[PDB]
Design a protein around this ligand. Structure first.
Ligand SMILES: COc1cccc(CC(=O)N/N=C/c2ccc(O)cc2)c1
Lengths: 20, 337
């Protein structure tokens, strides 16, 4: 499932800003 | 009237924009209690104002780190714009000041924690729940955009929940006053509009795109474009192909197709009728815009409050001593702060 794919991903924590 | 109120808002804003508040407190006036969140240049701590007993959130930026990341002008923007604005769903700046090492922005403490926290824990929000939050962001963006401000960092990490369940927008680090077009590549990968990524020059329509990303993330529990690396995210965004959960209502999908629209002649919020295309969309048919503004709508979610300085709705962070140099750093660079 897409949900499962997101939860196994590395970007479920706080996301940093990109300055450039 | 919306017209009347905004015109009044703009006069208020412009006086403060042209004559910003500066040096309105000192570090020693505050008792530092605990870190509430962190960021590239520093941290924000719960503090208590010694002469009043009032709690606030104090954002502490290391001048040398700002300089290293070539964020001087953005930081100046952040503080000049935040001290000038006033809207029920914007975090209020109460004091600002600087010392040899750091810049300080003392803001209202919003005790319910980050929307991010609640969204990740609960999984996803119901459509009425997402809609209640989305309405506040729509009004806030009407307000900011009327002042020629672009926000450029919408995401649940930056939306705090107040004691009554209403949203407070925080972190104005990428906010900018611009008439027309700008080009900086800034934001958060999952929330970037395609025209930012393709270096096209962009305008306030990027905030409406990001609203689409946020509503999707709120209602699905995951963003419409994710991957393990930003480069793959960007590829997905520019592709622009969006798939929706089977539980998304028809009206929600239609709204999002119009917000997550690569074509700027078709993207909602950016047409002749501007924000009214969004406010009058069917998904918002049950929303009382004036009552959202007046905070008369019952929140779907009220945070736990065990007492005035309580931080249980925030994650714990490693603490560090706030060392202030005996030599002034970067004085010229931050002279107008
Ligand atoms: C790029 O360097 C940074 C350094 C520190 C923080 C941040 C991000 C930020 O502004 N958070 N604010 C949280 C906040 C929390 C509670 C509250 O009542 C008001 C604001 C960025």
């Amino acid at each position: 499932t897409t949900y499962a794919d997101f939860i196994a991903s590395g970007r479920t924590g706080r996301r940093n800003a990109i300055h450039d | 009237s919306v017209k009347e109120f905004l015109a009044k808002a703009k006069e208020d804003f412009l006086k403060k924009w042209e004559s910003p508040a500066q040096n309105t407190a000192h570090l020693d006036q505050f008792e530092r209690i605990k870190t509430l969140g962190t960021g590239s240049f520093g941290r924000v701590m719960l503090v208590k104002h010694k002469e009043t007993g009032n709690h606030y959130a104090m954002k502490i930026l290391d001048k040398q780190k700002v300089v290293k990341l070539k964020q001087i002008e953005h930081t100046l923007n952040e503080k000049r714009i935040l001290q000038a604005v006033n809207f029920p769903f914007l975090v209020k700046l109460e004091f600002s000041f600087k010392d040899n090492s750091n810049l300080y922005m003392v803001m209202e403490y919003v005790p319910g924690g980050e929307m991010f926290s609640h969204l990740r824990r609960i999984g996803r929000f119901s459509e009425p729940h997402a809609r209640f939050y989305a309405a506040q962001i729509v009004l806030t963006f009407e307000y900011l955009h009327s002042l020629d401000l672009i926000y450029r960092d919408l995401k649940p990490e930056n939306l705090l929940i107040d004691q009554q369940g209403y949203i407070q927008v925080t972190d104005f680090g990428f906010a900018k006053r611009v008439k027309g077009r700008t080009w900086t590549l800034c934001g958060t990968p999952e929330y970037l509009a395609p025209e930012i990524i393709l270096s096209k020059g962009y305008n306030k329509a990027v905030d409406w795109w990001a609203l689409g990303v946020l509503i999707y993330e709120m209602a699905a529990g995951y963003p419409p474009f994710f991957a393990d690396q930003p480069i793959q995210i960007y590829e997905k965004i520019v592709s622009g192909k969006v798939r929706f959960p089977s539980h998304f209502s028809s009206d929600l999908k239609d709204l999002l197709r119009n917000l997550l629209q690569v074509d700027l002649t078709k993207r909602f919020g950016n047409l002749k009728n501007g924000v009214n295309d969004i406010k009058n969309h069917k998904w918002f048919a049950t929303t009382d815009w004036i009552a959202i503004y007046q905070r008369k709508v019952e929140a779907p979610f009220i945070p736990k409050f065990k007492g005035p300085g309580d931080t249980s709705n925030f994650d714990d962070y490693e603490e560090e001593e706030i060392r202030v140099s005996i030599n002034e750093k970067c004085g010229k660079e931050f002279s107008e702060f």
